């Protein structure tokens, strides 16, 4: 069967648009599945839950994952999906809610400066970096699929 961990392993992290992902129970905060190092701790899960109930918490304090503070960029509702976009240096990610859960994804290195800022300083030919839009789109397509299934 298509396990929750397989979604994290193959559908989320396995897409290449994120190095960490976690599917988390919306009310109980339980870890349905998680992968990578940038997975929110229980106290960080409760903060995300409070953020999903009040977007002004994201604007004033962002979200914390793996002990790292990420700045909130933009929140809203994409239909049945509540979304939160965050960023920290070259890293960032998104939170997308489903019917009874939400997905947290993280890409990039937060201790590094963004590749666009490095190119602005010195435009050098380098390897392809993760597009934050691709991370958002992958999680959005997944989240839309669970909502269609009812999860």
């Amino acid at each position: 069967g298509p396990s929750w961990q397989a979604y994290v392993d193959d559908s989320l992290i396995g897409s290449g648009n994120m190095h960490s992902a976690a599917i988390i129970g919306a009310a109980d905060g339980s870890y349905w599945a998680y992968g990578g190092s940038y997975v929110p701790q229980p106290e960080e899960v409760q903060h995300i839950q409070k953020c999903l109930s009040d977007f002004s918490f994201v604007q004033s304090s962002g979200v914390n994952i793996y002990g790292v503070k990420f700045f909130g960029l933009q929140c809203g509702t994409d239909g049945d999906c509540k979304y939160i976009f965050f960023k920290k240096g070259a890293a960032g990610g998104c939170i997308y809610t489903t019917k009874q859960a939400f997905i947290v994804a993280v890409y990039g290195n937060p201790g590094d400066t963004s590749s666009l800022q490095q190119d602005l300083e010195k435009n050098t030919a380098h390897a392809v970096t993760v597009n934050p839009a691709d991370c958002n789109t992958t999680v959005k397509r997944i989240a839309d699929y669970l909502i269609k299934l009812g999860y």
């Binding site: 977007f55 604007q59 004033s60 304090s61 962002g62 503070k69 700045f71 909130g72 960029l73 933009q74 929140c75 976009f85 960023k87 240096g89 960032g92 963004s114 590749s115 666009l116 800022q117 190119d119 602005l120 300083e121 435009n123 050098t124 030919a125 380098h126 392809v128 970096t129 597009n131 934050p132 839009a133 958002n136 789109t137 959005k140």
Partner: protein, 358 residues
């Protein structure tokens, strides 16, 4: 080969990526026989009704906007769209529908290979060499304060004021009427616009400027095309003062440039606050008045906390900053994978720019 087209409420700036300045700058109007676009519609206000496709930075009528784009690709740039990636610009908080319509027009009417829509203030910030800061963009029909972190704007902290250069020119006409001379014809309004763009300046000390202009009878001489001389007095610094005191035109709900920057910053996460104060980037034609950056710096320093020293960035090329950053962004290696290809449009539809362009 990549195209950069910055569509403003008054002026369109079109050029190629990699260049340091827009190669074609022309008014954003459409003239209809009582169809013509650009400088020629400007010069022919006798058989033509003039329309502005973009109002306050937002596209209002799409037929004339398509005409502007047609005149930009073929009559100005003299190029075929299918052979060139086009980077387009939009105002902050652009309605989702409008982005979908411009995407569909670019990908279907012009069958462009790839397309990207970027926020104008973000492009200005790129032109300033940083990806984090607050941009004050003041043009002809709209003014925005946009906080931005790592190349992404913070929409909850953006402020829009529907007042800019056109309102300033109208106010200059009004306050020049008090000398006994009226400015109602086309040529007279042209003279007023020229006086605003050439003689007006921001007073470093408004009350001291009033005193020095009243006690010394300081008046500047503007030469008219016919050789006659027009004396302009304190109006030179009373017109752009509206940008700092919008209540001069009854715009009490507009806070003015320093308080605009202050309130936008104060709506942000305080962890970024300092970095926003240290990178206040000015862009747009209405930021080009003399002493405007220094006055804004003094006021924002008076408002900021004690442990914060704000810094205003204002290069002599502010008016085209949005374009320059664009031509810079389309030149970076990271951006090459950020283009929205036509295949993605055929797959997901016009809504794809909601995910790829944020």
């Amino acid at each position: 080969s990549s195209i950069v087209c910055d569509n403003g409420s008054g002026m369109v700036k079109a050029g190629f990526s990699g260049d340091d300045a827009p190669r074609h700058v022309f008014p954003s109007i459409v003239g209809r026989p009582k169809v013509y676009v650009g400088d020629e519609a400007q010069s022919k206000r006798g058989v033509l009704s003039l329309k502005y496709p973009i109002e306050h930075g937002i596209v209002t009528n799409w037929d004339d906007m398509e005409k502007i784009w047609h005149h930009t690709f073929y009559n100005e740039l003299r190029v075929n769209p299918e052979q060139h990636n086009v980077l387009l610009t939009e105002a902050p908080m652009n309605p989702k529908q409008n982005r979908e319509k411009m995407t569909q027009i670019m990908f279907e009417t012009f069958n462009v290979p790839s397309l990207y829509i970027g926020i104008q203030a973000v492009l200005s910030l790129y032109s300033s060499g940083r990806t984090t800061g607050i941009v004050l963009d003041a043009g002809d029909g709209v003014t925005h304060t946009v906080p931005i972190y790592e190349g992404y704007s913070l929409p909850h902290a953006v402020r829009r004021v529907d007042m800019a250069g056109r309102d300033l020119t109208e106010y200059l006409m009004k306050i020049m009427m008090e000398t006994g001379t009226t400015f109602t014809t086309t040529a007279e309004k042209e003279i007023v616009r020229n006086v605003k763009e050439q003689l007006c300046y921001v007073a470093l000390d408004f009350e001291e400027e009033m005193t020095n202009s009243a006690k010394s009878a300081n008046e500047e001489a503007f030469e008219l095309p016919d050789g006659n001389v027009m004396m302009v007095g304190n109006q030179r610094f009373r017109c752009p003062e509206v940008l700092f005191k919008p209540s001069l035109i009854g715009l009490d709900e507009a806070p003015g440039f320093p308080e605009m920057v202050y309130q936008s910053i104060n709506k942000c996460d305080i962890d970024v606050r300092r970095e926003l104060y240290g990178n206040i980037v000015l862009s747009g034609g209405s930021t080009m008045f003399l002493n405007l950056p220094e006055r804004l710096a003094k006021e924002i320093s008076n408002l900021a906390p004690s442990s914060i020293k704000p810094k205003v960035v204002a290069p002599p090329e502010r008016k085209y900053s949005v374009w320059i950053g664009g031509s810079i962004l389309s030149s970076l290696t990271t951006f090459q994978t950020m283009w929205v290809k036509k295949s993605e449009y055929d797959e997901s539809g016009p809504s794809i720019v909601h995910n790829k362009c944020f």
